[PDB]
Design a protein around this ligand. Sequence first.
Ligand SMILES: COc1c(F)c(F)c(C(=O)N[C@H]2[C@@H](O)[C@@H](CO)O[C@@H](S[C@@H]3O[C@H](CO)[C@H](O)[C@H](NC(=O)c4c(F)c(F)c(OC)c(F)c4F)[C@H]3OS(=O)(=O)O)[C@@H]2O)c(F)c1F
Length: 138
Amino acid sequence: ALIVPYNLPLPGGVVPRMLITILGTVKPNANRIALDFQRGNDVAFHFNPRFNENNRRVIVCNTKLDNNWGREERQSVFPFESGKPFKIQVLVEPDHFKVAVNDAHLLQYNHRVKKLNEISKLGISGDIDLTSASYTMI
Ligand SMILES: COc1c(F)c(F)c(C(=O)N[C@H]2[C@@H](O)[C@@H](CO)O[C@@H](S[C@@H]3O[C@H](CO)[C@H](O)[C@H](NC(=O)c4c(F)c(F)c(OC)c(F)c4F)[C@H]3OS(=O)(=O)O)[C@@H]2O)c(F)c1F
């Protein structure tokens, strides 16, 4: 049981082979969830499940630079369910973040922010009960 929004420091930023694991439960009637991997005020990787965008469920990913959102990356697969426990794993690889939900690969997001070792915070927010947030090197 962690308070949301939660900040997970990433000391010395991220690096390939770093695995971030988030455990929680989606609230009933959730509207959205967000993971924000931040480089100072910039958002290197925003991962944003939306439960009701024009009555569709979609995950939006993007980068924020100098307070400007870039071009969104959207795909169709939506593994979250209101009221249910989830696991998000974010594995940093050399050219992308690799995301799996509930042990199934979901998406990749290519690195736009190049200075990986300055992406030194993960913010976790939105309509979840957050159980734990941690990292390990694999
Ligand atoms: C298929 O359907 C669509 C569509 F319907 C669209 F509208 C778009 C379109 O691009 N929509 C974007 C457009 O309307 C743009 C214009 O400013 O605004 C973004 S919204 C923006 O999108 C960003 C990523 O590009 C962020 O997701 C951003 N959200 C947050 O900052 C945010 C959040 F994600 C949270 F989860 C959150 O609380 C947990 C919160 F407080 C937030 F502020 C969020 O800002 S907020 O909705 O005002 O909060 C739309 O996605 C689209 F591409 C599609 F493909």
